[PDB]
Amino acid sequence: EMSLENVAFNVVNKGHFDGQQGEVPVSIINNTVYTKVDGVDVELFENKTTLPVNVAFELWAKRNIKPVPEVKILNNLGVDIAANTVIWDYKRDAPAHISTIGVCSMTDIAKKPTETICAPLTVFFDGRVDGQVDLFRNARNGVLITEGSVKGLQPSVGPKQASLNGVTLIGEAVKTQFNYYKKVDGVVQQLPETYFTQSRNLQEFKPRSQMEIDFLELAMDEFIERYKLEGYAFEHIVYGDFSHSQLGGLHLLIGLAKRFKESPFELEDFIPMDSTVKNYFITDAQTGSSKCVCSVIDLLLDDFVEIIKSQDLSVVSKVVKVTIDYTEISFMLWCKDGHVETFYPKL
Amino acid sequence: EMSLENVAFNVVNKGHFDGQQGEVPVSIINNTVYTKVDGVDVELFENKTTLPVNVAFELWAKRNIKPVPEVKILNNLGVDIAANTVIWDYKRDAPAHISTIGVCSMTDIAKKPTETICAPLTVFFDGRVDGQVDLFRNARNGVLITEGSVKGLQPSVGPKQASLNGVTLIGEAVKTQFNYYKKVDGVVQQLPETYFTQSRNLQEFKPRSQMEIDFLELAMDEFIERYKLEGYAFEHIVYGDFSHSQLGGLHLLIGLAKRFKESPFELEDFIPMDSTVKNYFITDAQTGSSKCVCSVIDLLLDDFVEIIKSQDLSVVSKVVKVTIDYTEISFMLWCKDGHVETFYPKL
Amino acid sequence: EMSLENVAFNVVNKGHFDGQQGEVPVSIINNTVYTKVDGVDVELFENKTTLPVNVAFELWAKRNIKPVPEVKILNNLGVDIAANTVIWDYKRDAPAHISTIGVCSMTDIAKKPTETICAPLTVFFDGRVDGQVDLFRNARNGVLITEGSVKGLQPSVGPKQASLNGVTLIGEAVKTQFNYYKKVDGVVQQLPETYFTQSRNLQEFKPRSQMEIDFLELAMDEFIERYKLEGYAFEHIVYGDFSHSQLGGLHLLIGLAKRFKESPFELEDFIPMDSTVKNYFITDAQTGSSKCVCSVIDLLLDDFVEIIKSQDLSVVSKVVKVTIDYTEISFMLWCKDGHVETFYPKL
Amino acid sequence: EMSLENVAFNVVNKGHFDGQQGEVPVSIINNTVYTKVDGVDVELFENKTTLPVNVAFELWAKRNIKPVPEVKILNNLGVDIAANTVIWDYKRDAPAHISTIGVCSMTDIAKKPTETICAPLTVFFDGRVDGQVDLFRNARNGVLITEGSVKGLQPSVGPKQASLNGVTLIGEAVKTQFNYYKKVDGVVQQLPETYFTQSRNLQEFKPRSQMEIDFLELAMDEFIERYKLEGYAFEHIVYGDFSHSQLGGLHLLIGLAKRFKESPFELEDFIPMDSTVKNYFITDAQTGSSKCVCSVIDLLLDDFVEIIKSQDLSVVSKVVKVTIDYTEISFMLWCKDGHVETFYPKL
Amino acid sequence: EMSLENVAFNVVNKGHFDGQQGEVPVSIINNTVYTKVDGVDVELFENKTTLPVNVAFELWAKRNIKPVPEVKILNNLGVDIAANTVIWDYKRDAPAHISTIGVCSMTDIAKKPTETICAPLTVFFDGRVDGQVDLFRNARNGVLITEGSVKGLQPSVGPKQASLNGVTLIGEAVKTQFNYYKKVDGVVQQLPETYFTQSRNLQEFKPRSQMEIDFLELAMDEFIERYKLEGYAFEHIVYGDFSHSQLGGLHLLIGLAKRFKESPFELEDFIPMDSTVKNYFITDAQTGSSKCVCSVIDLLLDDFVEIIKSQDLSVVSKVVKVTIDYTEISFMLWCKDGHVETFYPKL
């Protein structure tokens, strides 16, 4: 049975779609799904997508509830569609992909990824599901994740964190560290070496190295000397300059986290989606310094130090390419007299 | 005058419907009521109910602003409807009851509870309103609350807390501890002896006994020994097991509160209403341990200890009945070798 | 180009309307503007106004992103409309003014403030924009703000704080302290001497004098003696009386901030707009004391002390007028035996 | 009482707002007003305006239900707003004017047309309503209509037809022929000598002179011969050319009326409002000849013959001006070899 | 410029999108597009599609306004998408196809039909537009229509009628008879010999042969005698049986046309789209005979006689296949004693 009342039965009794049999009565009003409990209407789901309410409700109920790669990683690898599952995008509160394969009648383009309409699409496969390693072996364009080794294929070690029901975490009771494989036009690709962003947030920021512990505790001058960062404009790039009306620098998430613990500010996320580089309209409450487009990246500080120290501080300006999250991120390097003025990513 | 503009006049000038005379201009757009202040539109009310916007607005303005029983208590007693008042359900942001008596033309089924259409309904009466003790005396099916004694009737002492404008509190400047009476088919009933849930929330959790103070301070091993809880699986039931992908135990709200103060997690309330037992989709951020349907109850720990110590740990498994909030709650007891495996309620 | 797709191009690339050339594809559904990024829909804007979604979106994108006077100051000065800019009202999440001048085709009543339809309106001018001091000089009815001196005109020093992207702040990297000028029917007016409210909020409250530091630290009895406040009913007016079911006093925002740091309560803002005096439905969680209409003002405590000490405590009751935020605020003074019972503003 | 429930009481018991006292229960959902009749909801009003549903419902209930000038005439006379009434526009299913005077609190700009905000607006006054003639005498800008003489003021005889509850008619039981007066800046104007349109419609077209009777009855050749219409291209202008894929001519409503009874065609009114000139997207069903923009005007056939015979036929292209419905209409006149090629109006 | 305001400029000044430069102000509210004409909002477009209102408005403005094949023909030919145009479906009031090619940024899958995503799609090419014949020559899957010969390709003569702005017509001023060509995997196909339907409608039905003139004029008996139609159950199949509560027969549009002028009935089109076979819920008003599912096909009466006379009458039930509108139609043929009982199409 593929029906709205059976989807609602599974949500009410199992928390998500579990393939149980049964029905509950449902009312659809506004963009909202309601169900009746003891004679009163209880909201089950509010549609935030651009899809019909009943279609969005079913896709949400059928979301993957295992640790899955963050949406930004799948976007950078060019994933178009998932084989037999729904990746829910919790930043957008919507499905990550426009179409499905074997999930929902109103959005399926196929029931199996072997159908010819899927061959030109990059299909995401999940080695933890039975038979999907073999489906990837025969797929034309695919991305495969596994927890272990795949016989015949060289792995690429992915990020340590994954997403579990919208929570980004480095797993202890569960595995969040995947191997990645990619096929293009039938040929297995070699994925480039890459840094990974850390997927942390401002208020809950926790360091992941001694350098990041030192950065959050030490005064700015102490930190720069201890790690020998003279001439790299860390005061501008990382700490931020709040002395003028236009906010200077502040392009690393750990810099915002240090400023935020001492002085809260406003972060307007005007394009609310998951991406390697984020752009913010930031307003500093303490000083009134602000910037309309501030580009922020959450690299491990040890990685960002390693990146900026490998730059020729001798030319005036240039665009630098850095592989981060399997994609090439452009950094605008501004130098002056053998020293960095600033160094910031672009979205 | 029973009109939308007069309802809005009372909200703007008195904060709620107070029976004052006057009108303000109103605009209805989307599911929202607006009023004009200094030539600009100000939102008064956003309809979250399944009712028409103007009907929901009036019911909300006429909500009871005194301490009232929590909606879950009225549901457990089988209340269908209130005599001459609106119980607002702040969990659902909607009226607790589908119909009214003497409140609103679009939802009234009668103007007085003495009308014959009310006799088969369990009507909620409030002894703090004049004449309602006598209405209950003549009602066929009713629940009555009072602050003091009723001549002729044996009281049942209710919970210590009540709800005041959506805030659950044990009152000091006001009385929140009611006597309860029930009539069924014309006969006064004897309400059973019962435990009461405590209606606390995760982030604001405050203990209400020495055992709950000890539980929140002591290490797990200390607490279990001090109160002689060996063999009752408190480590599983109350503290929670976060070592596997499937979260074990964790069925008491105080257990979640202890875990939350040290490590925040995600609580998806997929049926958002007031009930004695709640079901949550929980994801632990620190470990990635999760459970789709976790049943949680907020009993005083001294009560839950008293309940579990009265169980025959000798049979393998059985359903136990416990009277809580005037209703019989089923607990699934799993035992092994004269010791509890787990003990959890069901919704 | 005045188009929805070009407005969305500016928002996506510049964070706000910046007059750049370009277009992005847009979908309008519900009351929401979406744009497509990597083939998925991303929400740019949710319309909370009573305007058409595409009109509200453009007005929001064209909001003033400089420090501007708080909306309550412009309302008190009788501003009807802004010359060539949009003042966004972040309390209402809507434009402050119904019409525009040279901003948007669907809301403009003129392209320039010199047009005859503007002459009877009080137009807000901004001296930081070129030519607007001269426009005010020729305007019939206007309010002008500058950072410096205007040749020929006597200034009125305004409040220290202004609003920057919805954040109220006293600026350090930017100027938030303006001079104010007003013209009525062609004649420059003398603005009255006035107190200013402080525009602080409950959870982030920070004192701005020694008396306010003392108030937040000292016990109530210490504070009253030290500053010689016997006979002015500060225990009632400022600290609040929570001993009865009806909450007594508590009309200064610093009083709520002191109570809130020790005991959280509920503040229902039933008319959500910016005004000098606010009215709240307050419920105290600790005691259950509550009041449907509690009028709160955020004066500097040194100012409120200075105001109440200048009152004749000899009459029973009267309405006192006080100039605050350029408007006359009525205070109901209740006295008994040469001492204040209470002293509260009215909205 | 000014309230939604009282407006719906008048609509239900009197067909429109008559100022009776009483209230009926009302539900508002979608953009529709409903009322309960014997326990079921009956729709009273569907909102087709861009106003809030309850505002539009009130303006519709208070529409003028006497014969009023057609909206096109008031527009051409520059009317901005009506004094103490609502002119409903039945083509648009919406109020003719954006604001009101003493009608509705949410749309009024004044309670009387003597208030200074109304002085720069051209206000419509109805001499059939008491005191309105004197309001006009004092007004600055206005249009006055009367049935008979006004002292001191020279009348202009308007059209014979008026609109009554949406129906255009020349009245027999009631008077539809009005005298017109216009003031601009306190000075009475001479209204120019004008032709008027006949406000007819295709499907139920009816001739109004012998020549029009001749036009629908006689063959095209007999007609052009009889009234000496050689060289004026009536075959093209009035009868229309359906031989090519682009429909030629057909710029007079009586012409379309003749073809319609002969052969069906579709008229897309892509700007549905009342104007002297209309534009249509016309698709002829028998031949497939069609034209995206066909400009149609409904003059008395004898009036239109009198017009094109007052033309100088020695110009390859010129723009003629005719006073029609008190406004100037641009006709494009193509000529070749001293004879007309075509002659059509401009919207 | 690709923008909503420029689309509405073309609609307002040209009746449809003509690629003119300019913009008009637009308001979007509900599912409707409005524009201001002299200070009041005029509706331009109501969205009846499942697309976002602004997307649907653009596709409608860019619809093909030349004679195009009827949607049913394209569906039967397997057309997936049109090359560089919008085929509007006037039955559904929506685009015929889900995606576009070089039309609209929110719906395009490509800018040209040469892009590899279009190769597996059956693309409709219009030989009246320049270069489209060659695009077809190179395409992998496609349908081509022309007015005249194409070199090397053998034509298939399609129907005589086409659709022009929603009106089905056999063109006289314009050509509606197309040659058809179909490629599948780069190989031109032989289109099968087919009958075509006449696309007529009841109320304004018009005979198209002597036999059809005979059918509407003569009595049923004279008709069946004249053309030798004994044993074929024309009284049942074509004329219909209204004697029982279940309506018998009546499977030909000309048959319904005859009854309609004789006696009114209601046809519920419970699947409102264009197909060779239609199903209706029919309720005969004079007798009360009715049928939930009545399958109606509109063949030329002489074509349908030629069909049922090519049948073997010695089978109790068989499924006949007729090529109609380039597709196969299943007719169920009941027979008994060597004569027809009924013969009706399948949807």
From Swiss-Prot, chains A, B, C, D, E:
The active site is at residues 236, 251, 291. The record marks 295 as: Uracil recognition site. Its cofactor is Mn(2+). The record marks 291 as: Transition state stabilizer. Uracil binds at residues 291-295, 342-346. Likely affects Nsp15 binding to RNA. It catalyses: uridylyl-uridylyl-ribonucleotide-RNA = a 3'-end uridylyl-2',3'-cyclophospho-uridine-RNA + a 5'-end dephospho-ribonucleoside-RNA. Residues 206-345 form the NendoU domain. Residues 3-63 form the Nsp15 N-terminal oligomerization domain. It is found in: Host cytoplasm, Host perinuclear region. Residues 64-189 form the AV-Nsp11N/CoV-Nsp15M domain. Coiled coil: none annotated. Plays a role in viral transcription/replication and prevents the simultaneous activation of host cell dsRNA sensors, such as MDA5/IFIH1, OAS, and PKR. Acts by degrading the 5'-polyuridines generated during replication of the poly(A) region of viral genomic and subgenomic RNAs. Catalyzes a two-step reaction in which a 2'3'-cyclic phosphate (2'3'-cP) is first generated by 2'-O transesterification, which is then hydrolyzed to a 3'-phosphate (3'-P). If not degraded, poly(U) RNA would hybridize with poly(A) RNA tails and activate host dsRNA sensors. Homohexamer. This is Uridylate-specific endoribonuclease nsp15. It comes from Severe acute respiratory syndrome coronavirus 2. The gene is rep.
